């Protein structure tokens, strides 16, 4: 399971080139070798986010959150997942929805990044 790490990193590197189906496939190899690890699933959510499939992205976030809780993952990661859902809504200019999910994120593990992003969502909401 230095194997799973290697699959994950090939996945990440591909994702970063916008080589999305390749990333997905390696994330899948990763999950197979190591299915208690939510990380692969949230990364997949990143992929769909960038492909611009916001619905599928939220679904994988939700799945990643389930997996993480079930397997007692870092709260931080659960928070990232929630914040990613928030981001998908932000992309869609559904700011009440974005903010709600940032709040969920913040309730799991408060991070400045998410706070700031939430507050800019608040501003957009407020100023029209």
């Amino acid at each position: 399971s230095k194997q799973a790490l290697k699959e994950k990193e090939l996945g990440n590197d591909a994702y970063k080139k916008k080589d999305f189906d390749t990333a997905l496939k390696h994330y899948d190899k990763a999950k197979e070798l190591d299915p208690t690890n939510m990380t692969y699933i949230v990364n997949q959510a990143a992929v769909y986010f960038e492909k611009g499939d916001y619905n599928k992205c939220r679904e994988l976030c939700e799945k990643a959150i389930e997996v993480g809780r079930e397997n007692r993952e870092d709260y931080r990661m659960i928070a990232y997942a929630y914040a990613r859902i928030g981001n998908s809504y932000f992309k869609e200019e559904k700011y009440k929805d974005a903010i709600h999910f940032y709040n969920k994120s913040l309730a799991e593990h408060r991070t400045p990044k998410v706070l700031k992003k939430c507050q800019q969502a608040e501003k957009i909401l407020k100023e029209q």
Partner: peptide, 5 residues
């Protein structure tokens, strides 16, 4: 892009 971990 969204961060991957």
């Amino acid at each position: 892009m969204e961060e991957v971990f």
